[PDB]
Design a binder for this molecule. Structure first.
Ligand SMILES: [Mg+2]
Ligand SMILES: [Mg+2]
Ligand SMILES: [Mg+2]
Ligand SMILES: [Mg+2]
Ligand SMILES: [Mg+2]
Ligand SMILES: [Mg+2]
Lengths: 150, 47, 143, 46
RNA sequence: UUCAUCUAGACAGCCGGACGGUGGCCAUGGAAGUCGGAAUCCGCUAAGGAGUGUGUAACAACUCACCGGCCGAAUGAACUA
């Protein structure tokens, strides 16, 4: 039984983990192939952390906050070309911005969903927040979860 | 010792050992410890 | 503008000198932005710690030497790189949350306040050894 | 005893180990003593 | 001379910290603060830019803005003759 910790973000289909995987005798396309069992939900940027025990294919893809955020948008397509350069800015997720910060395993470092979910809403530099809205100082005027969350 | 002279004169007088106890003694024997050398006795020898 | 924010500090400072009945003087020489941010999470429950400039505290202390007086002789301790930890917990338990945890190669407790008293946090590190053998070694001076 | 820590304790803090700095001690702590107990502590001392 | 900063500690000098969401989003061989398009949000804070520069293939590493330790009383700009 051996131990380590290497992490490489982004996630398309399942592709070389460079030299860090190399001088360890994992494999090139095989470490990338056991990284398909992970990269499956979602299909646009993740945060995988592969564990190393002698030769163990442990692709435990830990939760990226901007990813539980981006994934909370719609869907549409998966790769190739998007008539321009892709876009995703609409999703409501009114009470899903905090149900995402609730999934922020401890983390947050603040006053529960009051400050964790006022920052996760901020992490949304791509979507459109609670139904029809934006961000900025519309977060300081939030009344939900919090007392229920904490 | 400094914080074990009147505290021992408290560990052999009165009854129990409260914070409001020794403070009516060291501040009565015309020679107290350091007030903090007294409140310590309400901590390191509890019960 | 800058009288603005400073005065706001006198505010939340004066408020801790009243509410919390106890205080630690900690020293954060070196100590990362990351170290501190995680002594918060560890003491989030009871204690709360407050930081700032020296010359802002030597004044604010004296700024209310009227009421709350025995914070007066806190001043010959608020030099160098110091910090404040206000609490309403017992002694021992708090200090070791600070003195020990999140140390790499941590911050240090140099003086403690409890109702006009000045603990060196060295007469706080008691183990009922020189305190139980003083409720007994004098009992042989009584028997 | 009770006067054994008030007549033997005031003898290290400069105080007349008798009844003015030992019996009044009980008085300055609300404790019922006796005019012949500290004297019984004064006699047992010899 | 005037205006502004400054004993609630300036200016300068040396010295410490320079964090979490988070490799933020498009974009691509690869771009994680730093070839590059658009935003500049929060947390925590005494303080820390979704980033001044050095640098990597891309991370690292360093630096800085911002805060502090030390000191102890002056500093900044526009003018007058
Ligand atoms: Mg960096
Ligand atoms: Mg670069
Ligand atoms: Mg801030
Ligand atoms: Mg002056
Ligand atoms: Mg000219
Ligand atoms: Mg003129």
């Amino acid at each position: 039984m051996p131990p380590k910790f290497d992490p490489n973000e982004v996630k398309y289909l399942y592709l070389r983990a460079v030299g860090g995987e190399v001088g360890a005798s994992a494999a090139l396309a095989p470490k990338i192939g056991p990284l398909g069992l992970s990269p499956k939900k979602v299909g646009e940027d993740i945060a995988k952390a592969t564990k190393e025990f002698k030769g163990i294919k442990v692709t435990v893809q830990l939760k990226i906050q901007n990813r539980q955020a981006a994934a909370s948008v719609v869907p549409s397509a998966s790769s190739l070309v998007i008539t321009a350069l892709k876009e995703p800015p609409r999703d409501r997720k009114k009470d899903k911005n905090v149900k995402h910060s609730g999934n922020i395993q401890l983390d947050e470092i603040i006053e529960i969903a009051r400050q964790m979910r006022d920052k996760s809403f901020g992490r949304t530099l791509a979507s459109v927040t609670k139904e029809i809205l934006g961000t900025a100082q519309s977060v300081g005027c939030r009344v939900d979860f919090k007392n229920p969350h904490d | 010792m400094s914080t074990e002279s009147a505290l021992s004169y408290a560990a052999l007088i009165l009854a129990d050992s409260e914070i409001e106890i020794s403070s009516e003694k060291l501040l009565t024997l015309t020679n107290a410890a350091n007030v903090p050398v007294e409140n310590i006795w309400a901590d390191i020898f509890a019960k | 503008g800058i009288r603005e924010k400073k005065a706001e500090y006198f505010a939340k400072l004066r408020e801790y000198l009243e509410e919390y009945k106890s205080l630690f003087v900690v020293g954060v020489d070196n100590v990362s932005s990351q170290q501190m941010h995680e002594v918060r999470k560890e003491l989030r429950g009871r204690a709360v710690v407050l930081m700032g400039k020296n010359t802002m505290v030597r004044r604010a202390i004296r700024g209310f030497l009227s009421d709350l007086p025995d914070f007066e002789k806190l001043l010959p301790f608020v030099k160098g790189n110091v910090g404040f930890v206000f609490t309403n917990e017992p002694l021992t338990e708090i200090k070791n949350v600070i003195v020990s945890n999140r140390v790499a190669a941590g911050l240090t407790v140099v003086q403690v306040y409890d109702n006009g008293q000045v603990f060196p946090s060295s007469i706080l590190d008691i183990t009922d050894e020189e305190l139980v053998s003083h409720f007994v070694s004098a009992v042989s001076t009584i028997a």
